[PDB]
Structure 1
Amino acid sequence: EGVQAFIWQEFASALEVIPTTLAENAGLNSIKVVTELRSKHENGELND
């Protein structure tokens, strides 16, 4: 909460760039890949 929260949030949004450019090199819809990759990572945890 407060100020130093928005920073972390936009930091977590940044790290997501590696999977994006990984997928965009593969010619995939990087948005579709990540939305589904985060969704599967909210359950099946550390392997997706």
Structure 2
Amino acid sequence: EGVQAFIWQEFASALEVIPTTLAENAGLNSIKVVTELRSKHENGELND
């Protein structure tokens, strides 16, 4: 907790630019691709 919490939060948001572009270039719905990847990773899947 502190002033650096938002900086680390935006650091995590900017790190996901790679898979957002793969869904964009492949014509897939990106927002959907990144909402399912959170769901699969929370179930213990390290690689998805």
TM over 0.5: yes
**5+ long unaligned stretches in structure 1:** none
**5+ long unaligned stretches in structure 2:** none
Q: Equivalents in 2 of 1:17, 1:43: separation in Å?
A: 22
Look up the SS of the partner of 1:44 in the other structure: coil
Task: Give the deviation of 1:35 after TM superposition.
Answer: 0.5
Task: Give the deviation of 1:30 after TM superposition.
Answer: 0.2
Aligned-pair identity in percent equals: 100
How much is the aligned-residue C-alpha RMSD, in angstroms?
0.9
Structure 2 partner of 1:31: 31
Task: Give the deviation of 1:2 after TM superposition.
Answer: 1.2
Kindly provide the CA deviation profile for residues 3-46 of structure 1, in whole angstroms up to 9, marking residues without a partner as x: 11100000001111111001111100000010011111111331
Q: Equivalents in 1 of 2:45, 2:14: separation in Å?
A: 19
Runs of 4+ in 1 over 3 A off after TM superposition: none
Count of matched residue positions in the alignment of Structure 1 and Structure 2: 48
TM-score normalised per structure 1: 0.89
